[PDB]
């Protein structure tokens, strides 16, 4: 025998979207390991730029387009920061060739 129920059902008040737009305009956090770098990247949407948290600088870092690249680049990018500043703190930002933001799906 059971009894009792409830349902708030309160969300998206006065908000209407066409496609799930639940994403971050740019991840400024930090990656712990290559594996983690891949998970975060996917969320951001490839291509994904990878820089050294300790420093960074587009000139010198590497960019990834697929989990495979994210790792290959993370292993090095991380190793670099470990010698440049000392720590292996890395970074992941959204890379967009065109000046336009077409957040969404893409050919592949």
Swiss-Prot record:
According to the UniProt entry, which residues carry N6-acetyllysine? 32
The record's subcellular locations are: Mitochondrion matrix
Q: Which residues bind ATP?
A: 9, 41-102
Positions bearing N6-succinyllysine: 32, 94
Q: Which residues carry this modification: Phosphoserine?
A: 84
**What is recorded about the protein's domains?**
Consists of an N-terminal biotin carboxylation/carboxylase (BC) domain that catalyzes the transient carboxylation of the biotin covalently attached to the C-terminal biotinyl-binding/biotin carboxyl carrier (BCC) domain.
Assembly, in brief, is:
The holoenzyme is a dodecamer composed of 6 PCCA/alpha subunits and 6 PCCB/beta subunits. Interacts (via the biotin carboxylation domain) with SIRT4. Interacts with SIRT3 and SIRT5.
Disorder cited: Propionic acidemia type I: Life-threatening disease characterized by episodic vomiting, lethargy and ketosis, neutropenia, periodic thrombocytopenia, hypogammaglobulinemia, developmental retardation, and intolerance to protein.
What is the stated purpose of this protein?
This is one of the 2 subunits of the biotin-dependent propionyl-CoA carboxylase (PCC), a mitochondrial enzyme involved in the catabolism of odd chain fatty acids, branched-chain amino acids isoleucine, threonine, methionine, and valine and other metabolites. Propionyl-CoA carboxylase catalyzes the carboxylation of propionyl-CoA/propanoyl-CoA to D-methylmalonyl-CoA/(S)-methylmalonyl-CoA.
Q: What protein name is recorded for this chain?
A: Propionyl-CoA carboxylase alpha chain, mitochondrial
- The UniProt gene name for this protein comes to PCCA
Stretch of the intact protein here: 176 to 270 of 728
